[PDB]
Amino acid sequence: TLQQQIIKALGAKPQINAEEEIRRSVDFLKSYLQTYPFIKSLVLGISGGQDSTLAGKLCQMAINELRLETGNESLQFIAVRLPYGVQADEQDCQDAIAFIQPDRVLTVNIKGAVLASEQALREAGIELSDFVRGNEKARERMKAQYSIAGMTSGVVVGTDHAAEAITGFFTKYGDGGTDINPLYRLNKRQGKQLLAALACPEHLYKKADEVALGVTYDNIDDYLEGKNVPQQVARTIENWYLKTEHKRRPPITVFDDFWKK
Amino acid sequence: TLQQQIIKALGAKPQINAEEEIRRSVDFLKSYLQTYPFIKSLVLGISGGQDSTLAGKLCQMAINELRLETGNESLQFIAVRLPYGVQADEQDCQDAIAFIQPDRVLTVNIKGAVLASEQALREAGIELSDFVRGNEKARERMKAQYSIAGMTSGVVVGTDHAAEAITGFFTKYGDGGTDINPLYRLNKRQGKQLLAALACPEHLYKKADEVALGVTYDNIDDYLEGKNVPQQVARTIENWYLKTEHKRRPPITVFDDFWKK
Numbered sequence: 001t002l003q004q005q006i007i008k009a010l011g012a013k014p015q016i017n018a019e020e021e022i023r024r025s026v027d028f029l030k031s032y033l034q035t036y037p038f039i040k041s042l043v044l045g046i047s048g049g050q051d052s053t054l055a056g057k058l059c060q061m062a063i064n065e066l067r068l069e070t071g072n073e074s075l076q077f078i079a080v081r082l083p084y085g086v087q088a089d090e091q092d093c094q095d096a097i098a099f100i101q102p103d104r105v106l107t108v109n110i111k112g113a114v115l116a117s118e119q120a121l122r123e124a125g126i127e128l129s130d131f132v133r134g135n136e137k138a139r140e141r142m143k144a145q146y147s148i149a150g151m152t153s154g155v156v157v158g159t160d161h162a163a164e165a166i167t168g169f170f171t172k173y174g175d176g177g178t179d180i181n182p183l184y185r186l187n188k189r190q191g192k193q194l195l196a197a198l199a200c201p202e203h204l205y206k207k208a209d210e211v212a213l214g215v216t217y218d219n220i221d222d223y224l225e226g227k228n229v230p231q232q233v234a235r236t237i238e239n240w241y242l243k244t245e246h247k248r249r250p251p252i253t254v255f256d257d258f259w260k261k
Numbered sequence: 262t263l264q265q266q267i268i269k270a271l272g273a274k275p276q277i278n279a280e281e282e283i284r285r286s287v288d289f290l291k292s293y294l295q296t297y298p299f300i301k302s303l304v305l306g307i308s309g310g311q312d313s314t315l316a317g318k319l320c321q322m323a324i325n326e327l328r329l330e331t332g333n334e335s336l337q338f339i340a341v342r343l344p345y346g347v348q349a350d351e352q353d354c355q356d357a358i359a360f361i362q363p364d365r366v367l368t369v370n371i372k373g374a375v376l377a378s379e380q381a382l383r384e385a386g387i388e389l390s391d392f393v394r395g396n397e398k399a400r401e402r403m404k405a406q407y408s409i410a411g412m413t414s415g416v417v418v419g420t421d422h423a424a425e426a427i428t429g430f431f432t433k434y435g436d437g438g439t440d441i442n443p444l445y446r447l448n449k450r451q452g453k454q455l456l457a458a459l460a461c462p463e464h465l466y467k468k469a470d471e472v473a474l475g476v477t478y479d480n481i482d483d484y485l486e487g488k489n490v491p492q493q494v495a496r497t498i499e500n501w502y503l504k505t506e507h508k509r510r511p512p513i514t515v516f517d518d519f520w521k522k
């Protein structure tokens with residue numbers, strides 16, 4: 001079935017072992033850095049939400065272990081705060097930072113750049129809708145992170161996971177534009193499982209997308225776990241998947257044929 | 262050999278038929294638009310250089326033919342000028358536009374946005390090198406094009422081809438961040454062949470990268486055509502290819518193993 005094919009493509013499992021998955025992600029990050037020794041930093045945008053809090057903790061753990069094992073003091077995890085003006089859940093971001101205990105935290109306000117981009121487009125004749133402005137913000141955040149990685153010999157860590165990949169619920173070349181994604185394979189509730197195992201404060205992942213999707217995260221997680229969900233729900237999820245295949249593949253060329261089916 | 266594997270992966274051929282390749286690219290663009298009818302525009306940044314001039318002409322031809330065939334007057338090709346302040350070869354851009362005869366030309370000056378992004382980074386403690394600033398400009402151009410595509414129901418056309426893909430000579434999520442690439446498979450001199458067949462003014466592609474690469478475009482084209490080049494030259498090209506595999510694949514996950522070889 002299509003459900004079977006999607007589960008296989010995203011690497012999702014019905015149940016996972018929290019600590020075992022924590023080690024799988026940490027060891028992954030450590031192995032990559034030992035294979036490419038010129039990389040001295042891991043860069044990640046912290047939003048105060050579940051996914052970035054989890055990824056952030058895993059990144060710091062990876063660097064902490066590599067330092068002790070190799071003695072290389074130049075390695076570091078750089079957490080990046082990218083507020084648009086004044087961010088609402090700022091206190092949550094502070095709590096997330098306290099939990100992660102990052103080596104370094106840089107704060108870059110993207111408002112000025114976004115307004116400038118919009119002014120240039122307006123003068124040319126293009127006014128943006130709120131939806132498009134949202135993607136523009138996601139792309140400015142990508143830009144900031146890559147400029148930081150470029151000056152610190154680092155790579156940009158992404159928070160993409162199975163529950164977001166299946167619906168293509170990310171901005172193309174926005175938060176989707178990253179170098180390495182240690183959470184890929186996990187669904188939403190499983191991410192909470194890892195945070196619980198890390199003793200993360202409950203309020204940082206205890207409830208917050210479901211509006212635009214037409215399905216809840218529980219529907220998506222159940223689907224990814226191979227469960228039997230209402231047919232109408234399955235069709236909605238599958239429609240999103242097929243519609244967004246372009247977001248999970250490199251630019252289309254004359255050799256591609258996936259879009260012909 | 263590695264040369265054989267690379268040629269296969271990029272789809273390059275020793276010799277091509279100019280008109281036949283022109284039709285292959287145009288028919289490709291037309292087929293995609295007929296498969297996804299919600300797409301009403303093709304968006305492409307025009308720089309006055311060889312690659313964008315070629316891609317631009319092919320895009321306009323595709324739209325011209327689709328309009329006559331379907332009668333749909335809402336379809337259009339949008340050429341986008343994205344100068345950083347005052348562009349040097351501006352006259353060449355004007356000549357390129359005269360050759361392409363685009364339905365619409367929008368001019369968006371990216372200088373304001375780039376300076377704003379740099380100011381935000383500077384205040385946080387990050388000063389950019391000229392190289393990194395260059396990538397930042399490429400990413401702001403990507404941002405502008407996607408905002409335009411978002412408001413015009415369009416897709417972003419890329420100019421990536423075999424001679425650039427082999428060395429990864431493009432900005433990750435910059436000019437490399439596109440939706441559909443009609444030139445993919447062609448080497449540099451072959452691109453000139455297509456322009457000659459289209460009667461493009463010679464000065465628009467007659468000579469202009471080779472500095473940073475350590476090899477000339479003729480070395481790269483010869484390599485892609487399966488020719489026997491000096492071993493030192495082959496090793497340099499192959500080094501670039503292996504080093505930039507991350508640019509030609511989606512973000513790295515725990516399931517990938519290409520980087521382990």
Ligand SMILES: Nc1ncnc2c1ncn2[C@@H]1O[C@H](COP(=O)(O)O)[C@@H](O)[C@H]1O
Nearest residue numbers: 045046047051052080081082083159175
């Ligand atoms: N306010 C923010 N500050 C820093 N990073 C952000 C911000 N908002 C989004 N991000 C990053 O974008 C990722 C994707 O967010 P989301 O769009 O909610 O899936 C998060 O995991 C963060 O890494």
Ligand SMILES: Nc1ncnc2c1ncn2[C@@H]1O[C@H](COP(=O)(O)O)[C@@H](O)[C@H]1O
Nearest residue numbers: 135170171172246410411415416417440
């Ligand atoms: N079917 C498609 N094939 C290739 N690119 C597309 C397609 N549908 C949408 N896009 C591109 O993806 C963008 C929407 O992605 P996002 O900005 O992430 O919401 C549109 O502005 C187009 O540039």
Ligand SMILES: Nc1ncnc2c1ncn2[C@@H]1O[C@H](COP(=O)(O)O)[C@@H](O)[C@H]1O
Nearest residue numbers: 306307308312313341342343344420436
């Ligand atoms: N000045 C510019 N104006 C508009 N598009 C640009 C500009 N410079 C670069 N581009 C776009 O980026 C692509 C890649 O350029 P290149 O970095 O020279 O390989 C070109 O084919 C254009 O589509």
Ligand SMILES: Nc1ncnc2c1ncn2[C@@H]1O[C@H](COP(=O)(O)O)[C@@H](O)[C@H]1O
Nearest residue numbers: 149150154155156179396431432433507
């Ligand atoms: N070996 C690698 N694996 C994954 N990402 C990398 C690697 N080498 C470089 N990068 C990323 O790609 C960027 C360089 O690409 P560019 O900006 O196109 O010159 C660096 O700033 C890193 O974010």
Ligand SMILES: [Mg+2]
Nearest residue numbers: 047048049050
């Ligand atoms: Mg969020």
Ligand SMILES: [Mg+2]
Nearest residue numbers: 049051052159
């Ligand atoms: Mg998220």
Ligand SMILES: [Mg+2]
Nearest residue numbers: 308309310311
């Ligand atoms: Mg150029």
Ligand SMILES: [Mg+2]
Nearest residue numbers: 310312313420
């Ligand atoms: Mg080019």
